[PDB]
C-alpha cells in the first residue's frame, strides 16, 4: 500500500499509490534519500489529487538526491506537531521536530496543524480590552484580547525587548504562555532570540517554532499553522491565555505565493496566489477568544514598497486590531518602550469600548503631542525663543507627557537593575488626565523617565 516517486521537479514531487491507498489531501508522506552525503527522511504534503492514482506533493525538505521509484509511506494524517506543557522552553521546526534536542517531544500528544476556527456560536460577540499594564499601550493603543496587533519598527528600537516584555506580562499577569512563530526566520536571528530568551529567563514561558529562511516554501507556509496549533492546545485544552508572536506574517504570505507558483496555479493580481485572502483568513480566524480563553497575536508585518494597498498588507490589515510603531526618534530620547504615540493606533480606542473618560484623556494626550510635533520643526530651526508663551507652556507639558509614557519594563530589569512596573488602567487614565490638565508642569522633566503610576512619580520628584 506504499507509493512510489514518479516525478521530481524541485520541491514538487509526484507520487503514485495503489487504487485503494491514495492519501487524503494534506496528508504527510515519508520518502527516503539514501545518498550518503545528503541522506535524510523527506516529508511530503499532499497538495493535489492528479487522478490516475497520482498525487502532487510539496517537499518540506530539499529533494536533492531523491530518486524515482523510491518508496513513499503515507502516515495517515497531516503534519502533526507535539502539544502539551512540554513544548515550553524548546525550539521546534514547522514539522514538530525539536531543534534544540532532536527527538524531544516525540512521545507527546500530537495535533494536526490543520484545524477549523471556533464555531460561529462559540465566538464572543463583545470585543474585550487586554490590559497589558504598560501606560502607553493601555492608554493610546489598547490591545484587544483575542485580537491581532501589528508591530512596526526598525533595528535597535527595543522590538525584542518589547517582545520579552509582553512575554513577561502574559506569563505573570494573566498566568498565560507564549508561542513565538518565526516565519522565514533568519538562522542567526533565531539563535540570537533563543539565547536571549534563555538569558532573560523567559524561555521557560515560551515555545519557539522556527521555519527558517533556507527551507523550501512549504515549511515557511506551515510554520505559522504549527505555532498556532500549539497555542490552540494551550488555550482550549490547558485553559490558558496565550500570546502568539508571528515574525514575519508577510513571509507567510510570500511562501504561500511561492507554493502556489510551484503548483502551476495562475498568479492573481500583483503576482500573489489566487487564494491569498482565503489563506490569510484561515490563519487569522483561528486567533480569537473562545469560551473565556483567548489567543492574542502580535505580528510583525512587512509592507512591500511601503505600499499599504499592496495585496499582502491589504489582506493582512483586514484582520489587524491594533498597530504599534516603534520609532528611532523615541528610542534615541531614552523613552522605553519606544512606541510612536502618534503613528500607533488601536481600533477599540472608542468611547463605546473603553468608556468616555479613557477616550477623552487619550484624545487630549494625542492632541498635545501632535501640537508639540508641529512645533518641533520651529524649535529645531529658530529655537524655542521664537515660540509664544502658550507655545512654551504646551511644549513643556508635552515633553512631560511624552516622557511619562515611558515605563520601567519587566524585560528592562536585566539591563537596568530596577524591576518593572504594572500601572492599572484607571491609574494611568487619571494620571494622564492630571498631566494634560497641567497639575505636574512644575516638576522637572527627568522625574518622568521610566516610572509607573503616580506614587512612583511622587517618589522620584522627592528624590530630586
Amino acid at each position: 500500500t506504499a507509493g512510489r516517486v514518479v516525478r521530481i521537479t524541485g520541491p514538487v514531487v509526484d507520487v503514485e499509490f495503489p487504487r485503494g491507498s491514495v492519501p487524503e489531501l494534506f496528508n504527510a508522506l515519508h520518502a527516503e534519500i539514501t545518498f550518503g552525503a545528503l541522506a535524510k527522511t523527506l516529508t511530503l504534503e499532499v497538495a493535489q489529487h492528479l487522478g490516475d492514482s497520482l498525487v502532487r506533493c510539496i517537499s518540506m525538505q530539499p529533494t536533492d538526491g531523491l530518486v524515482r521509484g523510491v518508496e513513499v509511506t503515507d502516515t495517515g494524517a497531516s503534519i502533526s506537531v507535539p502539544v502539551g506543557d512540554g513544548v515550553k522552553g524548546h525550539v521546534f521546526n514547522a514539522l514538530g521536530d525539536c531543534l534544540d534536542d532532536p527527538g524531544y517531544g516525540k512521545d507527546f500528544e500530537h495535533w494536526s496543524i490543520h484545524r477549523k476556527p471556533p464555531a460561529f456560536s462559540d465566538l464572543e460577540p463583545r470585543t474585550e480590552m487586554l490590559e497589558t499594564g504598560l501606560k502607553v499601550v493601555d492608554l493610546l493603543t489598547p490591545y484587544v484580547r483575542g485580537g491581532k496587533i501589528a508591530l512596526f519598527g526598525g533595528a535597535g528600537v527595543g522590538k525584542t525587548v518589547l517582545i520579552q516584555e509582553m512575554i513577561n506580562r502574559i506569563a505573570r499577569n494573566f498566568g498565560g504562555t507564549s508561542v513565538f512563530a518565526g516565519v522565514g526566520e533568519r538562522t542567526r536571528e533565531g539563535n540570537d532570540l533563543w539565547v536571549e530568551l534563555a538569558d532573560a529567563n523567559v524561555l521557560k514561558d515560551t515555545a519557539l517554532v522556527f521555519g527558517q529562511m533556507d527551507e523550501p516554501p512549504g515549511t515557511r507556509m506551515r510554520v505559522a499553522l504549527s505555532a498556532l496549533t500549539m497555542a490552540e492546545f494551550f488555550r482550549d485544552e490547558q485553559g490558558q491565555d496565550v500570546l502568539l508572536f508571528i515574525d514575519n506574517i508577510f513571509r507567510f504570505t510570500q511562501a504561500g505565493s511561492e507554493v502556489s507558483t510551484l503548483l502551476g496555479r495562475m498568479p492573481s493580481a500583483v503576482g500573489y496566489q489566487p487564494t491569498l485572502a482565503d489563506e490569510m483568513g484561515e490563519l487569522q480566524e483561528r486567533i480569537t477568544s473562545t469560551r473565556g480563553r483567548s489567543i492574542t497575536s502580535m505580528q510583525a508585518v512587512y509592507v512591500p514598497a511601503d505600499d499599504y494597498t499592496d495585496p499582502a498588507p491589504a489582506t493582512t490589515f483586514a484582520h489587524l486590531d491594533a498597530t504599534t510603531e516603534l520609532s528611532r526618534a523615541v528610542f534615541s530620547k531614552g523613552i522605553f518602550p519606544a512606541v510612536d504615540p502618534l503613528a500607533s493606533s488601536s481600533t477599540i480606542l472608542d468611547p463605546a469600548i473603553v468608556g468616555d473618560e479613557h477616550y477623552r484623556v487619550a484624545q487630549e494626550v494625542i492632541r498635545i503631542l501632535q501640537r508639540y510635533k508641529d512645533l518641533q520643526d520651529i524649535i529645531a530651526i529658530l529655537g524655542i525663543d521664537e515660540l509664544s508663551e502658550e507655545d512654551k507652556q504646551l511644549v513643556n507639558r508635552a515633553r512631560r507627557i511624552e516622557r511619562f509614557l515611558s515605563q520601567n519594563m519587566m524585560a528592562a530589569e536585566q539591563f537596568t537593575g530596577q524591576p518593572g512596573s504594572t500601572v492599572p488602567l484607571k491609574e494611568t487614565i487619571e494620571a494622564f488626565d492630571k498631566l494634560t490638565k497641567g497639575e505636574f508642569d512644575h516638576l522637572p522633566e527627568q522625574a518622568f523617565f521610566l516610572i509607573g503610576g503616580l506614587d512612583d512619580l511622587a517618589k522620584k520628584a522627592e528624590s530630586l
Binding site: 545528503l38 530518486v67 533595528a155 533568519r186 538562522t187 536571528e189 533565531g190 540570537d192 527558517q212 533556507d214
Partner: protein, 511 residues
C-alpha cells in the same frame, strides 16, 4: 614537456564496469532530455560524450531534464549518457588561494593543477540554529562609512545593493584588500580568507579585478570563482554555491572567510533561464517558485559557528544591481529580506562627489555595534544623529544667518562629517586610522577647518601621526579602545598639526 603527456599516457588506464545508461531523446538551448537512467538522483551529475557534463534537474517517468554545463552544441539525439552516482561537488583545500577556478573547481588561470584537500557537495546543509553563536567580531572593510554607520561582523550577511556604476565592486574589493594586514598577522583567529565569485561578468572585468587584487597583495589569500558571461547558465547558477563550498571548507576548520557574490542578480537570471527552459511554472518576473529559496539557502551558509565547531565564520557580501534604484523589485526584495543589513549605493550621491555613494539614511546593519570595536563604538556614536540632523537642515544652507547658533553649528558639523566619510578608491583604512579620523570629525576638531579642506587635512594628519605619534595607533589597536591619556595626546597632536596646517584659501585653521 613531452614528459608531461608521457606521464599521463603511461598512467592512463580504463576498466569496464556495469554502467547504467540513458540516451539523449532531445536537446535544445542548453537543456537535454535523456531517457533511461532509472536510478539517477535529483541533481546527479551526468556525463555526455566528449566529456560534456550535465545536471539532472527535472525527473519524470518519461525522461530526465538535464542542464548542460558547457559545450552544449556537442549534444546530439541518440548519444549515450552515463550517470556518475554523485551529486554536484567541488574540490576544496588551501591550494585554492590565489587561483581562479570555474564553478567546478577547475583552474581557468592556466597555472596548473590544484591540490584538493578533499571534496565537498554543493548542497550540504547550512549550520543549524544551535550550531552558531552571536556575531561579535568586527569584519573591517576599511571603508569609514561602512565601518562606522553599518558595521559588519564575522558571520554576517551584508547586502551591497545599488544601480550600475555606483561602486559596489569597488567596496567589495576594498574590503578584500583591507584584509591584507590581518593576513600578514599570521594568526588564524585574525586572518580572513577571501572568496570572490564573479557571475556573468565579462572575462576582462574579472581580469581587472584580479589585477587590482594583485596590486594590493590580496591574491595570497583570495580565491576567485569565475562564471563569465560566455559560460553556460549552469555555471552562472552554480558559481555562488562553488564559492560557498570552498568557504565552508575553510569555515568548518576554524578559519574566517569573506565571500563576495558579484552579483546574485545575474545568478537569479541564469536560474530563471534554466527553469523556463525546463518548463517549470513561472511567477512574478517569470522567476520560478523557488528563486527566493535559491538565494536564501545560499546565504544561510554564511554563519558564525559555535566554539564546539571551531568558532570559524563566513561573512557574505552579496551584490545586487537595481534598475532605476527600484529596491522593491522581486530579487532585491528577496535578498534584502534574507540579509542582516543593507548598504544602498546611489548614483545621485556618487555624482555629488559622495564616494563611496552609501546612502547612510537608509543603509542599516542589524548587527550594529556588536560588530564594532569599543573605540569605534565611542567615536561613531554621534554620527547617525549628526548626519540625520544635517540632512534635515540642508534646506537652510544659504540661510545660516536665519538659523540660531545650534542649528548653524549642526549644519557645519554635518558638512564636515559628510566630507569625512568620503574615501578614495583602493584605499582601505586600518581600524585605528578610521577611529582617529572619526574622532577628528565628531569631536569638533574639523570645525575650524574649511569644508573643502577636510579630506586633505584628515589624510595629512593621519600621515603625521603614523610618522611621529604611532603610539596612539598602537594603543588603539592592541587595546581596541581610546584611553584618556591617548585621547589627550591625540588632541595635543591635532592642535599642533593645525598650527602647521594651511588651508587651500590660505586662512589659518588654528582655533
Amino acid at each position: 614537456i613531452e614528459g608531461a603527456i608521457e606521464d599521463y599516457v603511461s598512467s592512463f588506464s580504463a576498466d569496464t564496469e556495469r554502467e547504467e545508461i540513458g540516451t539523449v531523446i532531445d536537446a535544445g538551448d542548453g537543456i537535454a532530455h535523456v531517457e533511461g537512467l532509472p536510478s539517477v538522483m535529483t541533481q546527479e551529475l551526468l556525463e555526455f560524450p566528449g566529456g560534456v557534463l550535465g545536471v539532472a534537474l527535472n525527473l519524470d517517468e518519461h525522461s530526465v531534464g538535464a542542464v548542460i554545463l558547457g559545450e552544449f552544441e556537442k549534444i546530439e539525439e541518440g548519444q549515450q549518457v552515463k550517470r556518475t552516482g554523485e551529486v554536484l561537488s567541488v574540490p576544496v583545500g588551501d591550494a585554492f588561494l590565489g587561483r581562479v577556478v570555474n564553478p567546478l573547481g577547475q583552474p581557468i588561470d592556466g597555472q596548473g593543477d590544484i591540490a584538493a584537500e578533499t571534496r565537498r557537495a554543493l548542497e550540504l546543509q547550512a549550520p543549524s540554529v544551535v550550531q552558531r553563536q552571536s556575531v561579535s567580531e568586527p569584519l573591517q572593510t576599511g571603508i569609514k562609512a561602512i565601518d562606522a554607520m553599518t558595521p559588519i561582523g564575522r558571520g554576517q550577511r551584508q547586502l551591497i545593493i545599488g544601480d550600475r556604476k555606483t561602486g559596489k565592486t569597488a567596496v567589495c574589493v576594498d574590503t578584500i584588500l583591507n584584509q591584507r594586514e590581518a593576513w600578514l598577522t599570521g594568526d588564524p583567529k585574525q586572518q580572513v580568507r577571501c572568496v570572490y565569485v564573479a557571475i556573468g561578468q565579462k572575462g576582462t572585468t574579472i581580469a581587472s579585478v584580479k589585477r587590482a587584487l594583485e596590486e594590493g597583495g590580496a591574491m595570497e589569500y583570495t580565491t576567485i570563482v569565475a562564471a563569465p558571461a560566455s559560460d553556460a547558465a549552469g555555471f552562472k547558477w552554480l558559481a555562488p554555491y562553488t564559492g560557498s563550498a570552498i568557504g565552508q571548507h575553510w569555515m568548518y576548520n576554524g578559519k574566517h572567510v569573506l565571500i563576495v557574490f558579484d552579483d546574485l542578480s545575474k545568478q537569479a537570471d541564469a536560474y530563471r533561464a534554466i527553469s523556463l527552459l525546463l518548463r517549470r511554472p513561472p511567477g512574478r518576473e517569470a522567476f520560478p517558485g523557488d528563486v527566493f529559496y535559491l538565494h536564501s539557502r545560499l546565504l544561510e551558509r554564511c554563519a558564525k559557528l559555535s566554539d564546539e565547531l571551531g568558532g570559524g565564520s563566513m561573512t557574505g557580501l552579496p551584490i545586487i544591481e537595481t534598475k532605476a534604484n527600484d529596491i522593491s523589485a522581486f530579487i532585491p526584495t528577496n535578498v534584502i529580506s534574507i540579509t542582516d543589513g543593507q548598504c544602498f549605493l546611489e548614483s545621485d550621491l556618487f555624482n555629488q562627489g559622495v564616494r563611496p555613494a552609501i546612502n547612510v539614511g537608509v543603509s542599516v546593519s542589524r548587527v550594529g555595534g556588536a560588530a564594532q570595536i569599543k573605540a569605534m563604538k565611542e567615536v561613531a556614536g554621534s554620527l547617525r544623529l549628526d548626519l540625520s540632523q544635517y540632512r534635515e537642515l540642508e534646506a537652510f544652507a544659504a540661510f545660516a544667518s536665519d538659523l540660531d547658533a545650534a542649528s548653524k553649528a549642526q549644519l557645519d558639523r554635518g558638512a564636515r562629517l559628510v566630507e569625512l566619510l568620503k574615501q578614495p578608491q583602493y584605499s582601505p583604512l586600518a581600524v585605528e586610522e578610521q577611529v582617529v579620523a572619526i574622532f577628528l570629525g565628531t569631536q569638533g576638531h574639523l570645525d575650524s577647518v574649511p569644508v573643502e579642506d577636510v579630506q586633505r587635512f584628515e589624510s595629512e594628519l593621519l600621515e603625521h601621526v603614523k610618522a611621529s605619534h604611532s603610539d596612539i595607533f598602537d594603543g588603539i589597536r592592541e587595546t581596541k579602545k581610546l584611553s584618556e591619556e591617548a585621547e589627550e595626546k591625540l588632541v595635543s597632536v591635532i592642535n599642533e598639526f593645525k598650527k602647521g596646517f594651511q588651508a587651500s584659501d590660505g586662512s589659518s585653521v588654528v582655533v
